[PDB]
Design a protein around this ligand. Structure first.
Ligand SMILES: Cc1cc2nc3c(=O)[nH]c(=O)nc-3n(C[C@H](O)[C@H](O)[C@H](O)COP(=O)(O)OP(=O)(O)OC[C@H]3O[C@@H](n4cnc5c(N)ncnc54)[C@H](O)[C@@H]3O)c2cc1C
Ligand SMILES: Cc1cc2nc3c(=O)[nH]c(=O)nc-3n(C[C@H](O)[C@H](O)[C@H](O)COP(=O)(O)OP(=O)(O)OC[C@H]3O[C@@H](n4cnc5c(N)ncnc54)[C@H](O)[C@@H]3O)c2cc1C
Ligand SMILES: N[C@@H](Cc1c[nH]c2ccccc12)C(=O)O
Ligand SMILES: N[C@@H](Cc1c[nH]c2ccccc12)C(=O)O
Ligand SMILES: [Cl-]
Ligand SMILES: [Cl-]
Lengths: 517, 517
């Protein structure tokens, strides 16, 4: 069979330029790549938060080190997401926060420290799980950098950056490596009688042909949904939010520091992200139009940050869900054209480079063997539905009951069998997926991470943070007092590391400044 | 001169039964009224939306309160029309909606709040005009009722109802009051040598005579057009749509609520109405056959609502325009026999009862003084052409350029001198017609409303919603800082009212249910 020679990517947002760059790198020879993007249709870039696989799967693949791309996108550091006011109905006299940290919780004799922590909690231990089981949360409270001043990494972390700048950076990178860029707008898509894409007709009268089409057109799914008619599976029965109101808010970094984490601040009818970088933070109130109006939600977002009726706002709507199939015939959807999940756990850009990784892993020839696309499609469904369930578990496990929105989340959601099963194991006191890999191994082994994306520590951060704990500690521990004492020594080491970080790390603001404004 | 004694109405649709009922009520003595309607020729009833004068001019005249007629027609509430995707080319990531609300915008020192809002917008104020100037749009977003649970009206509103049921209700009402109903079909119309209608010959061999004939035969204009040869002024040079594909779509009211407004959803080659009531919504894609085929437009309508190729559809065509004269000799046209304008601003049923009001105001004797019919005809021309221009202003002011249809609307329409003049005043920053009347006064003074049917607030809802704003705020305001501060207090009161409505109104679904399924 003839190899794919010509590839056309529709879309110049983060997805299209990630696609262009990943494919140009992956396809060393024989491929001609063209990207068409409209000057008239804006990209989606709100201020974006990411996870460690961005470097390991995406930039490392391109051969671009962190120090090369970070400054060009005004990158900042992200060590966690901090959930605020999620646990029960907010009270301004009470500090309700918890962290979801990157990285694996250590095991002690085959049992994760989360489980020894729970046994202590049964005996009256007061410290929250993540402060007991991870060395870094107090450092995040102190707004400390993830690295020593000399750049030596001290905790697993990822990035916050200007999403437009990321698209721009990759545009430059891809074009320089032979990617053909066309600034124009696709107006019609012709299919042959068999249902394959023949060509794209553009506003300026260009006819684009290719062996392979990558739909990066964003939520409109110009090829996959509109031309190819692939059903979008609306998952608004699983998750209620459908809207965001977003802006950048200036930050007084010299006075207030730069928080080395994304915050998720539960609101009345959704939650507000906060994504700090030097000089400002991206923020957006993700809300459900069924429970609040855009105008009301806008009042709230402005009130939250003391912002004026004059502050210009990025008003957004979205459909939650995914295509029935991500790749149909000769078209692969990547990015917002493929699926969307609210940004509660920073999975959006992950879905782009994870899908691209899988595309290259299942790369077709011009015959388009359906066995390849079937296998690819199955990977995408696992990836998405697994993240959807994880996000949904933040909502159905909450103890908040103060608004219609929170009550709906507690009572009215449709839950997959898979998430019910995980919750059941957790409640029984069983660990979820654990590994004896350290973080380096995990984050360097994407075939492992892709299929084991949420580990025991991830579930525990969320469920413990939200105040849903197992019915009991692991029965096995009752037989293992030596192991319990071994775990005590491990908790002691974590505390020692935390105290060392406290006095060793520069502030995030100082470190970012030393990398340079 | 001898009074009119015998009246024959041809047609049993909404127009004929409104005519029968209005005339039987108006003509207390000396009139004998017969209505002939064919069992073989269907009525036009799609699911219909109305305006407040329906109660004030029509049902109040009959002496029928809202609570008497509403339940019998499965009525629902309408507080606005919500225009979706009209402002620029649709993007599924963007919420493009605006409301056209019933009721007058308040004045502050002789200047409408729309104009203070514009001055704020010049200074960076971000809130849309209708959310600033009216207390109810956020309540409509929350699908709230127009009344408190005890029925106390909280905003100006009108109705959605089953149009067949309305015709049926009035049929029963009119017949009970002495209207003679004949189920038969007129097959020939005899004119005397002078051109007056002598008689109607029917299929069953009846010969109908009368002093006065009311043509309610619908678009065929059996008497006015076909027998009397009155020219129809085709206005397809002003407005491009000529077709609709319509259906009822089931609604999940318990899950999704019942929207207390009509929606106008701009499509590729026209727009789709949505008219909610309990259990379902009437919908129709109004389109231009010049830009799309009925088959294509049907695909779109089905796609819009996720409907099946098995869904039976009300396929419609129409001519836009009006007779050169509505009343000729002894025949008065009322309803679709007189004129048609696409339902963009819910004027169709208005044209019926407004025309009937004017008929009674110009009521003839058997001599048919042409001074009476001339005066009546002039009122009808003003009424129609004024609404035509208002509707047309939705089309020529749009910024959409994504289809041939939208481009034609921006560039290819013939505009009246009257509408050019209004647009010019608006662009100069001048208010259009304002009144210091409150809504109660306006809607109780039909001689005022009939001649001042679109006020400043109506034009501003549409032009601001579509994104065409004046070149500048009113120069006068530069001299009136105290007035500007007074307006601020008024905007503050509106916001307070909006927040009170948010927590005080029942949902529209709940309220309608309490009135009863
Ligand atoms: C509210 C919100 C918050 C988010 N937060 C995060 C986060 O914190 N972290 C994270 O990782 N991800 C986040 N995401 C996801 C992230 O923004 C997207 O995954 C990412 O930016 C890629 O978008 P995209 O390129 O698929 O689509 P878009 O940005 O919508 O780009 C679409 C491109 O296609 C072009 N186009 C469309 N139609 C045509 C046509 N007819 N002809 C030519 N060009 C066309 C447009 O011009 C544009 O270039 C968030 C998303 C949303 C909506
Ligand atoms: C697509 C569309 C959407 C609309 N939407 C709205 C809206 O949202 N709101 C609104 O207020 N209005 C709306 N209208 C207008 C509204 O439907 C009409 O104004 C109204 O229902 C009255 O119609 P009619 O009685 O004039 O004619 P028809 O309903 O066509 O009735 C004609 C009557 O005359 C009879 N007839 C015809 N010829 C003969 C004959 N030879 N002998 C005996 N009987 C005869 C028929 O049997 C029938 O009884 C819309 C109209 C259309 C076409
Ligand atoms: N395996 C992913 C899990 C993840 C996604 N979003 C997160 C946010 C916070 C912590 C972990 C995550 C990671 O460690 O990167
Ligand atoms: N004077 C009419 C104007 C009107 C017609 N159709 C409308 C639709 C929405 C708002 C106002 C209107 C009214 O207030 O009833
Ligand atoms: Cl995300
Ligand atoms: Cl109408």
């Amino acid at each position: 069979n003839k190899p794919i020679k010509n590839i056309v990517i529709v879309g110049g947002g983060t997805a299209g330029w990630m696609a262009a760059s990943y494919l140009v790198r992956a396809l060393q020879q024989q491929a001609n790549i063209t990207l068409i993007e409209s000057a008239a249709i804006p990209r989606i870039g709100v201020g974006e938060a990411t996870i460690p696989s961005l470097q390991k799967v995406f930039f490392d693949f391109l051969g671009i080190p962190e120090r090369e791309w970070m400054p060009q996108v005004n990158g900042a550091f992200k060590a966690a997401i901090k959930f605020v006011n999620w646990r029960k109905s907010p009270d301004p006299s009470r500090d309700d926060h918890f962290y979801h940290l990157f990285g694996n919780v250590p095991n002690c004799d085959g049992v994760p420290l989360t489980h020894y922590w729970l046994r202590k909690r049964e005996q009256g231990f007061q410290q929250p799980m993540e402060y007991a089981c991870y060395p870094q949360p107090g450092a995040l409270d102190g707004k400390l950098a993830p690295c020593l001043s000399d750049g030596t990494r001290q905790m697993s972390h990822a990035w916050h950056f200007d999403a437009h700048l990321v698209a721009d950076f990759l545009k430059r990178w891809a074009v320089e490596r032979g990617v053909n860029r066309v600034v124009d707008e696709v107006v019609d898509v012709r299919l042959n009688n068999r249902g394959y894409i023949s060509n794209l007709l553009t506003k300026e009268g260009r006819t684009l042909e290719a062996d392979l089409f990558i739909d990066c057109s964003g939520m409109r799914g110009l090829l996959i949904n509109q031309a190819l008619k692939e059903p979008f599976i609306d998952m608004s029965d699983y998750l209620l939010c459908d809207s965001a109101v977003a802006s950048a808010v200036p930050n007084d970094d010299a006075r207030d520091g730069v928080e080395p984490y994304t915050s998720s601040i539960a609101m009345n009818s959704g939650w507000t992200w906060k994504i700090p970088m030097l000089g400002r933070f991206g923020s957006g109130y993700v809300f459900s139009s069924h429970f609040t109006s855009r105008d009301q939600a806008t009042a709230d977002f402005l009130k939250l940050w003391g912002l004026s009726d004059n502050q210009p706002l990025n008003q957004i709507k979205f459909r939650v869900g995914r295509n029935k199939r991500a790749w149909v015939n000769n078209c692969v959807s990547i990015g917002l054209s493929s699926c969307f999940l609210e940004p509660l756990e920073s999975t959006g850009i992950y879905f782009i480079y994870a899908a691209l990784y899988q595309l290259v892993k299942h790369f077709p020839d011009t015959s388009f063997d359906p066995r390849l696309s079937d296998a690819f499609n199955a990977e995408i469904v696992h990836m998405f539905d697994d993240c959807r369930d994880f996000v949904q578990a933040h909502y159905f496990t909450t103890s908040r009951d103060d608004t219609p929105f929170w009550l709906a989340n507690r009572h009215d959601l449709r839950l997959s069998d898979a998430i019910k099963e995980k919750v059941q194991r957790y409640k029984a006191g069983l660990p979820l997926t654990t590994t004896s890999f350290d973080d380096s191994t995990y984050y360097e082994t994407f075939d492992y991470e892709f299929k084991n994306f949420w580990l025991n520590g991830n579930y525990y951060c969320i469920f413990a943070g939200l105040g849903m704990l197992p019915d009991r500690s692991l029965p096995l521990l009752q037989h293992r007092p030596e192991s319990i004492e071994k775990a005590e020594a491990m908790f002691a080491s974590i505390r020692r590391e935390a105290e060392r970080l406290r006095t060793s790390l520069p502030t995030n603001y100082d470190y970012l400044r030393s990398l340079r404004d």
